[PDB]
Symmetry: C2
Amino acid sequence: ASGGIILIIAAALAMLMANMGATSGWYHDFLETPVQLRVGALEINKNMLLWINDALMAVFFLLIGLEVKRELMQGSLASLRQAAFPVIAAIGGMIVPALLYLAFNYSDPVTREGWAIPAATDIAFALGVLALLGSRVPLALKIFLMALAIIDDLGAIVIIALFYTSDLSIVSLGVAAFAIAVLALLNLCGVRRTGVYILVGAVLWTAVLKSGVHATLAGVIVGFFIPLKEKHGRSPAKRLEHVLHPWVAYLILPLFAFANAGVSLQGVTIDGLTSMLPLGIIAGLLIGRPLGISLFCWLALRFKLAHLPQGTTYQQIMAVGILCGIGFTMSIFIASLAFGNVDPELINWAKLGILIGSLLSAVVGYSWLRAR
Amino acid sequence: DASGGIILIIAAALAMLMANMGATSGWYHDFLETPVQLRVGALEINKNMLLWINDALMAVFFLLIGLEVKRELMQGSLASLRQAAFPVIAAIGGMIVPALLYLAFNYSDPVTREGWAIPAATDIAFALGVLALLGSRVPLALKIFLMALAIIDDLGAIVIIALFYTSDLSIVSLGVAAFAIAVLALLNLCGVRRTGVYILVGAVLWTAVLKSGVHATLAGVIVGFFIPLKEKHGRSPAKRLEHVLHPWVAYLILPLFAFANAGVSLQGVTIDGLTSMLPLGIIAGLLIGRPLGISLFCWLALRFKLAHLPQGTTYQQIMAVGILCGIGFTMSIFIASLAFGNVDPELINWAKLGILIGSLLSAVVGYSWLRAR
């Protein structure tokens, strides 16, 4: 549970940075510093926070690409029957939070673009709460919770990068196609040097640098092409996952939380928090997330399509759904993509609803499994 | 084997083909001169494409050097307490004679006097690669002597350039750089074994001195000096890092540096042009200044019993490395790129001609004259 506490400290300092008179100002002007890269006729204009998030989430989703790959062949998602229960819980833990969010924001076309905000879950935070009181928590829950949030987080990035995304340059997709083609020929030829995949992945990440969501998917694509074979007792993807895990939990995610979880609390009132944008996220995370997860897990159990992990009780499942309401870093990153290049207060109001929703989802989920 | 020395030649041959045939001479020239402007708020760095490439490739190349130096200066060949003072006294000779010989040609031209360190370097990849082309039963300490001799001239040239012939960096750059050295020293005293943490700090050090290509390169050896080398628990962060860094430097960094620098348009090159004070001064400094400078200073060190000729070596075999130490190539091109920066753009072009001709004449003579002995 070490990675969970060090993530809150980074968010707590970010709040102190954005609310103290001496720190706020330099904290806001730094994150909005223009960074213009000019290469001949080419020109990439992104602010400081954009360059930071495009690089941090690329490494974070590279670890996910390795984790998804070994879960899809060796873990819970390996077979179509074992993967039924986590996937069914994911579709429910998305359509119900979205409908609740859209129930509040259907009248405003600007805000209903972020319907995928209360559909994410901070994996490092949710695992941290479990590991906090996890002396004898059923190991199948951590496999279920990790697999449940992995599909909702990756699915949200794929959906955003397919429809609500802006089409990139034709030259960008051509290099991206060639970069994936090289990664494909590399895996088919049987090369196992992890750095060569990262070298080609850097070309893939650079070609789609203008789109933050495509540069994020570059990490997922590279993580899928890292070989997992166990030749001579060595695996590149298992070894790369072992190296990235401490760097992501102790540097990547803390830096992302310190640079995004900092909003000013001056002027925030109860009536302001009950408006459609923040309350829609609060209701989507605190209520919509456990409801859809509990409903779809239960519907699967009754209609014969379900599988059950070891020591299920199916009362711990809904408490996990409450713990899935901890969007935090993932929901903030989803909100940064949905509420980009629009009114600068949309992203601030979203972060207020995410943190209140995540803190309440953490305490309520803490109060149940503690009793169990 | 000698695979690294051949790839370094293919990359240089490809670079020469790009800059001579009309189908690619336009793109190869316009690409390397493309301006790359990075503007971070009020800050701004303006360098062409080749500078950004060289400041990144040579930073990785010298990171591997700093690892080999610390190994060879504490538990290796060079070591300390005058264990291997034979390459030390030779390295001083391998720099004084090539410099004074080069200055004898360019003393009348103050512009070309700055490049007195061009024929005072040695391409370790090509010099050891041609030594492996006959490396069936060559003495192991001979290839050690070359690797240690070339490092002192290569690292010593960068230090002299970064102390007197360098551009002034901002006081803010030196502050962040010195603060990066402080944490590097603190991470070393605290026994931090993570290789990535030293490089993450080195990324701050490299970006702080990014406006000066010499200091950005000099920042690579410093990171290699602070990587822990202690063999506790069977682990050695400097050894394993070098084992991973070595195949990348030999097959990617040096070939790309050669492909991006060895490309010179030979159109209009005449015999009278190659015999000018600038190119011929590099020819004599490499083909003559390096062998005569090394052999003469080994002579003075041997008869005066200052140093000892290593086991498995001969003095006639020693000078076979001297004629083989005239392999400037990528290292001398990098030295020439720093000394002839922000001046007439044709100075670096004539310098490269005097480097490749002097090195090719050094490789053929070194190969043909050592195979007899």
